[PDB]
Amino acid sequence: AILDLKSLVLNAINYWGPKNNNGIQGGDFGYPISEKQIDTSIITSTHPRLIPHDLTIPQNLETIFTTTQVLTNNTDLQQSQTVSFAKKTTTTTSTSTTNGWTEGGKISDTLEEKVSVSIPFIGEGGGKNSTTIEANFAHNSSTTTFQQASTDIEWNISQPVLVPPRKQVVATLVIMGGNFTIPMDLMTTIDSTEHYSGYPILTWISSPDNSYNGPFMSWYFANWPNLPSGFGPLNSDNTVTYTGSVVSQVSAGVYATVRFDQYDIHNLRTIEKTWYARHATLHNGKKISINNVTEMAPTSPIKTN
Amino acid sequence: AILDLKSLVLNAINYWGPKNNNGIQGGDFGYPISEKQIDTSIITSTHPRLIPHDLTIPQNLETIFTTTQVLTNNTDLQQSQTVSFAKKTTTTTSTSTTNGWTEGGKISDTLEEKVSVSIPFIGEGGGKNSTTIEANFAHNSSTTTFQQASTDIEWNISQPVLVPPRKQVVATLVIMGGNFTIPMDLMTTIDSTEHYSGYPILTWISSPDNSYNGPFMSWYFANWPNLPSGFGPLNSDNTVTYTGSVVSQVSAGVYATVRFDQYDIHNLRTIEKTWYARHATLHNGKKISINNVTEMAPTSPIKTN
């Protein structure tokens, strides 16, 4: 859930009040105090960090783009030709907070973070592969509403291919992608715009006639016996880190292959020969063995001793 | 357990052999082959990484060192004196592999890694605190035997203290430490000293007369249907990462305080007054509010509006 930090602060104040006056020397604030006697607008959220719980089970992929290039040689000499693809695709992430916090109902501005996430994946025919993708993730600890972010990438594939005399070679680019659900921790640190004696002031406590006030320091929040589980200990700078959580839905292209089909130039109905470029290209630009993502186990010759 | 990678490699070879000869073009290796027909000594373990599963429950501490310094003023003028402590302590870690692997029973050389680990801790009186310690961890994926490592640190505490006329002030240093059990992942990557077509060769397969051989490439290991769970997919460089595990026992000093007791110089039997230095010192050298680790809630004055 999205916890109401203002309510929790009020509850902590009303716990300590009758016991030690929240450390304030003097005053009659009239415990239990009303929410009208505090003002938590000075609370800040700092150092936000998404920490993915990286996927380990190889994920299924689907074709997300396919296109062709036609290469022709109507001469009697073999020609070294070059096939080049340049395709822009957009990775999308949709991130929703499961556990988070808000100061009294306030919705903070959504922030964006680049995060590296593991993408284990299955090739055509069932091959198991591992890679990593860096993508933009939007996040907002104050609401469960989905936060969208886009990351544009470019698939740049260049390939020399030997085109025999009187042949047409068709090159087919296929990009495989998937939809992945990635849970992450979302840590945010509670601090304040105001401090006293080294402690964030989570609110001032006003007397019922608003004539005087005293500060509510973070020590009293961190050490409040009924503090909910997601709130951490006092940090070395007297802030308190909340360990929240999100789930992100990630739609991304993962790898691309190039297939070649050769035809007699006079008969473009019948494929004479088919083969793949020896490497596939990953999202992150790395090249991997084509055998890893197709039904072609790698072969080798015998060696004499 | 410590898996026998040599046995697993043999099993993978004998799975694929009758089906596609492990991709080797020709030869009669006589499946199922004997362990005598392989040699996995070329397998390497690379990129070892300890990844702690960081502790979140604040841990209990005990006094691990205490010493004193005596400051004396037999004059009629207050004196600003300085108390200084310099104490060396040694953090120890003892790390045992739960899940790992060995090549045929071989025990690799133990390696050492500096790792940062979270240390949530409880102060005197119950205060909750958070810190981090960097320490040496020894690790060895090939054996369950404990691997020890030491990390020396220095506690340097310097404090001016105002000593009234005709008083003795005794400064007592107390260092609190604990014993923590930290589970970690231990990732190691399987590679080889030899490669063919971009793939690590996990072994050569020899004919029964040792007259010829063919390479067993990593593709066949990663895609062997009975591969045990800890072995990952093919990486982008055709290696295979094993996700192993260790448990480490960590003995470390966490924080230090300095207490002052004041006596009339003529009566060293009766404490007149006691107070603490306003900050404690952490293992990592940072200073924290003394209130965080003692039974002294922070106080504040009232402010007029």
Q: After which residues is chain A broken (C to N over 2.5 A)?
A: none
Cβ neighbours, 10 Å, residue A178: 17
- Helix (H), strand (E) at residue A10: helix A5-20
Find tokens 């009975």 and name the residue. Answer: B226
The answer to whether the beta carbons of residues A95 and A149 sit under 8 Å apart is yes
Three-class HEC string of A24-86: EECCCCCCCCCHHHCCHHHEEEEEEEEEECCCCCCECCEEEEEEEEEEEECCCCCEEEEEEEE
Cβ neighbours, 10 Å, residue B259: 17
| CA distances (Å), origin B255, targets B87, B286, B290, B296 | 12, 9, 10, 17
Distance from the B231 Cα atom to the nearest Cα atom in chain A, whole angstroms: 11
Distance CA A283, CA A180 (A): 15
Distance CA B216, CA A300 (A): 9
- Resolution, given in Å to one decimal, reads 1.6
* B36 Cβ neighbours under 8 A, 6+ residues apart: none
Distance CA A101, CA A202 (A): 14
Chain A partners of B234 at a C-beta cutoff of 8 Å? 127-130, 288, 292
Distance CA A260, CA A192 (A): 62
Chain A partners of B232 at a C-beta cutoff of 8 Å? 56, 120, 128, 130
Distance from the A117 Cα atom to the nearest Cα atom in chain B, whole angstroms: 14
- Helix (H), strand (E) at residue B186: strand B167-192
Distance CA A71, CA B291 (A): 77
DSSP-assigned letters across all residues of A192-228: ES-EETTEEEEEEEEPTTSSEEEEEEHHHHHT-TT--
Cβ neighbours, 10 Å, residue A11: 15
CB pairs under 8 A between A and B: 166
Q: What is the DSSP letter of B207?
A: P
A-interface mutation test, from B220, B241, B289, most A Cβ less than 10 A away: B289
- Residue B157's nearest CA partner among B92, B79, B88 is B88
Chain B partners of A293 at a C-beta cutoff of 8 Å? none
Q: Is A297 on the interface with B (CB under 8 A)?
A: yes
Contact B219 A25 (CB under 8 A): no
Domain ranges of chain B: 1-305
Chain B partners of A23 at a C-beta cutoff of 8 Å? 297-300
| Residue A180, Cβ density class (10 Å: 0-12 exposed, 13-18 middle, ≥19 buried) | buried
Cα-to-chain-centroid distance, residue A7 = 31
Chain B partners of A13 at a C-beta cutoff of 8 Å? none
Distance CA A150, CA A148 (A): 7
Distance from the A60 Cα atom to the nearest Cα atom in chain B, whole angstroms: 14
Q: Is B223 on the interface with A (CB under 8 A)?
A: yes
Residues in A 107-126 with any Cβ partner in B closer than 8 A: 120-121, 126
Q: After which residues is chain B broken (C to N over 2.5 A)?
A: none
For the four alpha carbons of B193, B199, B203 and B208, in that order, the dihedral sign comes to negative
Q: How far apart are the first and last CA of chain B?
A: 68
Q: Is A305 on the interface with B (CB under 8 A)?
A: yes
Nearest CB to B219: which of A206, A291, A303? A291
The answer to whether the beta carbons of residues B18 and B31 sit under 8 Å apart is yes
**Closest residue, chain A, to B128 (C-alpha):** A233
- Rg over alpha carbons for chain A, rounded to the nearest Å, is 30
Residues in A 133-172 with any Cβ partner in B closer than 8 A: none
| Residue B284, Cβ density class (10 Å: 0-12 exposed, 13-18 middle, ≥19 buried) | middle
Contact B305 A26 (CB under 8 A): no
Structure tokens belonging to residue A101: 């916090």
Distance CA B87, CA B210 (A): 64
- Residue A67's nearest CA partner among A287, A259, A281 is A259
- Helix (H), strand (E) at residue B15: helix B5-20
Cβ neighbours, 10 Å, residue B75: 13
**Closest residue, chain A, to B24 (C-alpha):** A300
Nearest CB to B212: which of A198, A214, A304? A304
Chain B partners of A300 at a C-beta cutoff of 8 Å? 23-25, 196-197, 214-215, 217
Structure tokens belonging to residue A190: 């509670």
Beta strand pairing call for B79-102 and A279-282: unpaired
Nearest CB to A232: which of B130, B214, B301? B130
